[PDB]
Amino acid sequence: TATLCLGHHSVPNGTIVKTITDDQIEVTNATELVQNSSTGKICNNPHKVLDGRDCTLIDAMLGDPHCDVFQDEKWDLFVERSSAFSNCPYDVPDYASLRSLIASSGTLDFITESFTWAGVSQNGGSSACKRGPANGFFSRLNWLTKSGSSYPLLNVTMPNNYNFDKLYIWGVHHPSTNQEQTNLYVQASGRVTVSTRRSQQTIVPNIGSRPWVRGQSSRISIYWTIVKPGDVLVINSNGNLIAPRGFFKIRTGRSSIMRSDAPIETCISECITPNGSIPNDKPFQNVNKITYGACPKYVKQNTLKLATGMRNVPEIAGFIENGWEGMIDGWYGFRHQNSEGTGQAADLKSTQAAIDQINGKLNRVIEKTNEKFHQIEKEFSEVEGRIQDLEKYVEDTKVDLWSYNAELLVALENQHTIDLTDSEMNKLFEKTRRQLRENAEDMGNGCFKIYHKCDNACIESIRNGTYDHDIYRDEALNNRF
Amino acid sequence: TATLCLGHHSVPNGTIVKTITDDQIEVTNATELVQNSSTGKICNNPHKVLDGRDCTLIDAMLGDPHCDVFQDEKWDLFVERSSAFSNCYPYDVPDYASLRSLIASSGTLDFITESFTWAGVSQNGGSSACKRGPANGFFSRLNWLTKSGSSYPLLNVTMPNNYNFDKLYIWGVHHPSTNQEQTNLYVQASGRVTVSTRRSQQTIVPNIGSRPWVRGQSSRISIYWTIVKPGDVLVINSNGNLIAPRGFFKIRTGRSSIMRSDAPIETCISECITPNGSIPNDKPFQNVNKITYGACPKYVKQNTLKLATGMRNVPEIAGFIENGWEGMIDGWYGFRHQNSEGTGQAADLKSTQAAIDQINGKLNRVIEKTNEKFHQIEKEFSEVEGRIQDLEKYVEDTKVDLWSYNAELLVALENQHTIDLTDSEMNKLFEKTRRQLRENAEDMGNGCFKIYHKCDNACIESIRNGTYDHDIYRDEALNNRF
Amino acid sequence: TATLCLGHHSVPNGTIVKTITDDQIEVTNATELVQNSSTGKICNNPHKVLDGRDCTLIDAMLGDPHCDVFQDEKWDLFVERSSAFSNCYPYDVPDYASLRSLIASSGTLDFITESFTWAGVSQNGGSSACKRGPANGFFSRLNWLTKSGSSYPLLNVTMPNNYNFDKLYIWGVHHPSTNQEQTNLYVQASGRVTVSTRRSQQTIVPNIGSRPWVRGQSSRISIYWTIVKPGDVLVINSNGNLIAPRGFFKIRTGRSSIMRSDAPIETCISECITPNGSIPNDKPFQNVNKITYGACPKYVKQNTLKLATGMRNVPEKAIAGFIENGWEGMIDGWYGFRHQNSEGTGQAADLKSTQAAIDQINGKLNRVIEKTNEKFHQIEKEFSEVEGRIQDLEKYVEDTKVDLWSYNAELLVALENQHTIDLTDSEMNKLFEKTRRQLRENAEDMGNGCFKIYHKCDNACIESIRNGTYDHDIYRDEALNNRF
Ligand SMILES: *[C@@H]1O[C@H](CO)[C@@H](O[C@@H]2O[C@H](CO)[C@@H](O[C@@H]3O[C@H](CO[C@H]4O[C@H](CO)[C@@H](O)[C@H](O)[C@@H]4O)[C@@H](O)[C@H](O[C@H]4O[C@H](CO)[C@@H](O)[C@H](O)[C@@H]4O)[C@@H]3O)[C@H](O)[C@H]2NC(C)=O)[C@H](O)[C@H]1NC(C)=O
Ligand SMILES: *[C@@H]1O[C@H](CO)[C@@H](O[C@@H]2O[C@H](CO)[C@@H](O[C@@H]3O[C@H](CO[C@H]4O[C@H](CO)[C@@H](O)[C@H](O)[C@@H]4O)[C@@H](O)[C@H](O[C@H]4O[C@H](CO)[C@@H](O)[C@H](O)[C@@H]4O)[C@@H]3O)[C@H](O)[C@H]2NC(C)=O)[C@H](O)[C@H]1NC(C)=O
Ligand SMILES: *[C@@H]1O[C@H](CO)[C@@H](O[C@@H]2O[C@H](CO)[C@@H](O[C@@H]3O[C@H](CO[C@H]4O[C@H](CO)[C@@H](O)[C@H](O)[C@@H]4O)[C@@H](O)[C@H](O[C@H]4O[C@H](CO)[C@@H](O)[C@H](O)[C@@H]4O)[C@@H]3O)[C@H](O)[C@H]2NC(C)=O)[C@H](O)[C@H]1NC(C)=O
Ligand SMILES: CC(=O)N[C@H]1[C@H]([C@H](O)[C@H](O)CO)O[C@@](O[C@@H]2[C@@H](O)[C@H](O)O[C@H](CO)[C@@H]2O)(C(=O)O)C[C@@H]1O
Ligand SMILES: CC(=O)N[C@H]1[C@H]([C@H](O)[C@H](O)CO)O[C@@](O[C@@H]2[C@@H](O)[C@H](O)O[C@H](CO)[C@@H]2O)(C(=O)O)C[C@@H]1O
Ligand SMILES: CC(=O)N[C@H]1[C@H]([C@H](O)[C@H](O)CO)O[C@@](O[C@@H]2[C@@H](O)[C@H](O)O[C@H](CO)[C@@H]2O)(C(=O)O)C[C@@H]1O
Ligand SMILES: *[C@@H]1O[C@H](CO)[C@@H](O[C@@H]2O[C@H](CO)[C@@H](O)[C@H](O)[C@H]2NC(C)=O)[C@H](O)[C@H]1NC(C)=O
Ligand SMILES: *[C@@H]1O[C@H](CO)[C@@H](O[C@@H]2O[C@H](CO)[C@@H](O)[C@H](O)[C@H]2NC(C)=O)[C@H](O)[C@H]1NC(C)=O
Ligand SMILES: *[C@@H]1O[C@H](CO)[C@@H](O[C@@H]2O[C@H](CO)[C@@H](O)[C@H](O)[C@H]2NC(C)=O)[C@H](O)[C@H]1NC(C)=O
Ligand SMILES: *[C@@H]1O[C@H](CO)[C@@H](O)[C@H](O)[C@H]1NC(C)=O
Ligand SMILES: *[C@@H]1O[C@H](CO)[C@@H](O)[C@H](O)[C@H]1NC(C)=O
Ligand SMILES: *[C@@H]1O[C@H](CO)[C@@H](O)[C@H](O)[C@H]1NC(C)=O
């Protein structure tokens, strides 16, 4: 007689995963699906990262004297440090919109235009904004005051004869007293009107004392205007006008701005976070919900294990609640007890089928990467109300939905992996049973008892699939009965 | 002796779908789940579609002379063309999008005239920039009041809401270009308009200054609106620069909206409208446009998604073990028998019907029929604004990504389950057939049986029907086997 | 000879569930996953609920005379009733919703009085529209400054922030109805109010004009607010039309919110609060309201979702097995054996298969979906007036969220039902296959889920088969002789 047993491998150390029907199940192999660490540095490749050391984007746009190294710059990502400061006092109504559009433009290209201001004096300065040892001002703005003892009505025009949009930055000066207002501007109540063929803005200055900032009790408000090709710009002013010196060329692209204190190093990475660059070889990440580039999706979980092997079962006997830790050639194989001696082999068909069905399984459902460049703000330092609440709500909803998606996907994939491995083992056992028609009996433990003399060539023929039952039919029948 | 095999059908040409464990598997039949084309026309049934032609909704509401055919109009969807223009006095609307959305969602342009009394001022002002034929004109729903004689008295009027519906009032403020013009039109050197109710107020101070010429005018007019709830009162107080209203608009709650499109409108029936045109809604997903009106499929980024309908296509007596039957056209599963009389073939109705019933209506168990949406947010912009536009784009992008993921995962899961159920059906039929033949037959290794007793056509039909009796032939089969 | 059968239990009354491959399938047990009812009452534990009664949050903050009981109050949820009204000077708040949300999220009404000096003006002005008992009054947290004698000097005051917490200041501007009233109350013919810090500024010019009478007044007051960070300074500059502040509000960070409801408040314990009332959170989904506070189930559009708990239900039709036949007489377990012998029929139960099925079924839904989500302050979801862009965006966001979560719930229920049915069927088949494996050549299956054994198999034999210590070599010769 002879014995033939079928089984599967085992490893000394398994990994616990979670499926649809099991809280904890041990498998031979698993992989991590969530990235939860960073090196703390920002790669300067392949994206173009511009470090604004002590300057904000608005300050560099306006022309702060200590921000003059940023003139005519361009970037893919602008990094704003927490140690930035202003050294020139002003306020911007709707600051966030201007900051966002300047960041999304991706450039600081400024073209000077020849404005004519007749009857007034130009190039005013203050001691609060020093350009060297002398008084200065913003380099992209012009402070106009009275000439002699008169301040006439200003009325200038400039058409857009190009084929791209223009961006104009202008301002209004708010004095602190009526005496100062009349001293700088002869009229007791100024007025600034800037309009195009389709839009208009009129600002009336406000007079009143304010806290001293670098020695000044007055302020300046900043406004902007966009002129389409074929349109025209008209500026009408009675006083308190901070005239523009030109226009900014505005483009459309994939630029943005980020707040971070991580240093920038010479390295390559496609994903940038405020914590630093992270690899994008995993479908999910847990570092930061603020990202730039090709980045994994953000989830609330810190670990998600995906099974890449069959069950780990501790240990002649077959595969019925028994693993073979002595198998290193393949996933499934045969063991036989013969007159010549015991032997072991491996089956390549089932092993390769399982490997093919396992490899690349996650790519069939979830896409590889998503490239997002400019998005909404997700951290705030001041309380505002309605819009901030809406933004926070949207971000929270997105995060919760994606976390649920990740959890369900991982559970389903683990369940299907376990099912396919079990099906492969059972199919191999059933094929082996079907090949031996009447010459063998099932021993009850995944093994077969062959009732005729089956030598090594016989076992090899059984394993190959070229076994003939008619050769040993009568001998097996005589032995069985 | 005899032979009884089991098998399944196959087709000369199959389709490749994707499952959970397979990236490409061939099946006998599949259907497309994504709609990706349109005819370029807009159906005027069953929704009421109003063509704006050369007019916008705001211009038609104000009373533009070339938009006078749109007075007292009704619509379910308003279509705005890119060739629309303005031909009246230049104006601007602060928060234009909010008023446009309000008027579009109201769904009607019904106007009721009221008896306003303006004592001491001139009425019915006009300009050469807004012509009613050969003579000067103005917006038909607004009244331009200027000085009478040499005085402009203080205007203070009231109007109560004694109905049971909301009232919408449209008024304006005139911004002159020079101080001399301001003094000439209105005696006072600084005008002021105050419009208020018992719960809200608005005060506007005009701005004097030159502006680019538009149809010969360097002055502008700003447009404002006020809503008066039932039982409330409206008070208008002014001393210059008032563009008075002539009445109120009825404002309703409904399912109306507005769209920007250039597709023509033709006689046809469709429940879904896109800027590209009308599309059928028989499929659960679409790829034409993310701007939709009516009962429409969900927008996904995928161009195609195939759902499996049949079984695995296996190319071609032998059984079902890696062998499909090309010559079978009468069913999905059946029998082939080899006998002394000759060969034959049949089909199994029960297993085929079970598989068909399981397959039929498979996708309706999860996805709702249709999502009918009428008024939504704007999804395309022609000018950069900032915060709110970014928020809207972010919301739309998140929605699109989530629904694309849902569609992909669902299609993969359904294909996997269809393949599994069909394989289980075939294996169950074979197992039952083996179960009937207790000891008179044994499996030959290729999904087919070898019978050791003389089993004729009546015998084969008895086996197929499920009424086979092994006791009659047991002794002969046992003698043949041993 | 002896007969051995395998089968499963069934119940007289079943319940219908929905799976991936079946529209309507009957099982032995199921549970409801959607909470669609409420008691109509709000529990005051464990959250601190503050009833607004006839006052709103803004009215309580300003100092309305009939809202004077809400001074220095704290809350976790503020409940605003539909019967609230105002009984003081008419006013309007530009961007009212932002201030309401700010005060609701702050969670307290703590007020600290500060010593402002207003030189050359008369303080503590009142009106007949706001009565403190028999006499004329005003808001308790605001100061109405008017001319003293025949002059109104320019006011310029400062107040530094020397603490380590943010300050909130509430002030206002008065809008007269006539120029004569403007001149009588304030000497200057045009007022101006400037309030600023080192990083912000606000200037308001009053409006003049008649308005509808509210409690005898055709004038209004506009409300503005300012926040001062630690180390900053506040400056107020004005020459008329100023409603001065009396101090600052302590502003905090926390998990407080506000809700509009008309449900009464009783003594009970509940972790979730809805405008309909409190609901239990023992289910993953609910259908009551999309406005919630606390640990609440997710909101879905469906009103019922049944999760299968048992196996398929098959009516019971010489003993028979599990092939299209249930056992209504089995109450000892899920799977078992039935044997007919010469001594008589017998029945038993199998514990391992039943225990495995129960352990797989138990706790199945906790593996994918989280228990509860704690949300405290969110966006508004109901509006009493039409506004335009922002309201449309909020409605769109809420509708998208609801649709996505409803789809998730439906798909999850269907998948779980399918897997439960599959696991029960697999367990029964595995038990039958093991029973076949034990009897190698001594019996053959009859096809109805039963084995009939050729040798003599008594109670010891049947018990050995059930346990698993059955030996086939003992009866092999007798079985072979009987079969052939
Ligand atoms: C309306 O009300 C506001 C606020 O109440 C007033 O604003 C104040 O204006 C005064 C000037 O009139 C400001 O005083 C100035 O402060 C400067 C900064 O002081 C800070 O820094 C120094 C050094 O670091 C510290 O010692 C000090 O404590 C502060 O922390 C000083 O540098 C100025 O000095 C100048 O004047 C002195 C006078 O002796 C000279 O000796 C000096 O050489 C120098 O010339 C000056 O003292 C004050 O800071 C303002 N306060 C605020 C909050 O802004 C308005 O003046 C008031 N308007 C009217 C019309 O009344
Ligand atoms: C403040 O600054 C602004 C802009 O700098 C000034 O606005 C300009 O005002 C002048 C008039 O004062 C405008 O000139 C007018 O332009 C009309 C349109 O011009 C277009 O069309 C004509 C004909 O097709 C073309 O030839 C031309 O190139 C343009 O393409 C003309 O139709 C007007 O014609 C009138 O004047 C002529 C003079 O010869 C007469 O013969 C005509 O019959 C007719 O009466 C006129 O020329 C100019 O367009 C305005 N510019 C802008 C940008 O709007 C303000 O006037 C100024 N304010 C002060 C107080 O100085
Ligand atoms: C600009 O235009 C507006 C609106 O047209 C005017 O506002 C009106 O001003 C008048 C003048 O005061 C107001 O009249 C007063 O109304 C009070 C309330 O009346 C309501 O309530 C009573 C009782 O509940 C009802 O019977 C009545 O129908 C109203 O529903 C009255 O109580 C006042 O009575 C006083 O005067 C009478 C005079 O005989 C005395 O007998 C009384 O004892 C008492 O002293 C008074 O009649 C009117 O309410 C205002 N309407 C609105 C809508 O605001 C502005 O006045 C106007 N401005 C200018 C400069 O012209
Ligand atoms: C363009 C201009 O007028 N520049 C002035 C500037 C302004 O007058 C002021 O900042 C606007 O509010 O002020 C400068 O400072 C002045 C002192 O030099 C002078 O002694 O006193 C003035 C006040 O009475 C004023 O502070 C400055 O800021 O440097 C002078 C500069 O030319
Ligand atoms: C209601 C009214 O006053 N209408 C005027 C109109 C206005 O005066 C003006 O548009 C407001 O800015 O202007 C009209 O045009 C005028 C010419 O006819 C006149 O020769 O010159 C005027 C300038 O000095 C003015 O342009 C118009 O727009 O048709 C006349 C109309 O009655
Ligand atoms: C702080 C103050 O001035 N308070 C006045 C108040 C105001 O004058 C008014 O409400 C602001 O618009 O008005 C009071 O009412 C007055 C009557 O008592 C008086 O007979 O007539 C006045 C009109 O000419 C005015 O209505 C009030 O509202 O009680 C008096 C209060 O001291
Ligand atoms: C990445 O940086 C963020 C900073 O935004 C870290 O999140 C903060 O972590 C600290 C310390 O636990 C908390 O006190 C803050 O509340 C967190 N902020 C937010 C917005 O969550 C985060 O821990 C960092 N992650 C890694 C891996 O370095
Ligand atoms: C329906 O119309 C839209 C117009 O928005 C088409 O989308 C544009 O397609 C062109 C050509 O590929 C692109 O260059 C644009 O970028 C697309 N615009 C947007 C906003 O996506 C769309 O292709 C049309 N679809 C059909 C089926 O005609
Ligand atoms: C909980 O209260 C809400 C209040 O909005 C109820 O929803 C309204 O129910 C009425 C009556 O059927 C409808 O006419 C409204 O259209 C509903 N409003 C909304 C926004 O859906 C809700 O039915 C209540 N729930 C329970 C269980 O009583
Ligand atoms: C486990 O799987 C990973 C990839 O999924 C593979 O690289 C690794 O070799 C596997 N483990 C073993 C022991 O082969
Ligand atoms: C393929 O399936 C569709 C159902 O989507 C059916 O209408 C069609 O008849 C099927 N094809 C064949 C050849 O049966
Ligand atoms: C059905 O299941 C519930 C819990 O899921 C349990 O409380 C109940 O007893 C079960 N019903 C029966 C008849 O076992």
Author numbering:
A (entry chain A): 12 to 99, 101 to 327, 337 to 502
B (entry chain C): 12 to 327, 337 to 502
C (entry chain B): 12 to 328, 336 to 502
Task: Give the original sentences from the paper that presented this experimental model.
One of the key factors for host jump is the switch in sialic acid receptor-binding specificity of the virus, mostly determined by amino acid residue substitutions that occurred in the receptor-binding site (RBS) of glycoprotein HA. The discovery of a degenerative codon at position 228 in the human H3N8 A/Henan/4-10/2022 HA protein sequence, which may encode an amino acid residue G or S, suggests dynamic viral adaptation for human infection. We find that the human-infecting H3N8 HA has a dual receptor-binding property with a preference for binding to avian receptor, and the G228S substitution slightly increased binding to human receptor. We then solve the structures of the H3N8 HA protein in complex with the human receptor or the avian receptor, and identified the structural basis of H3N8 infection in humans.
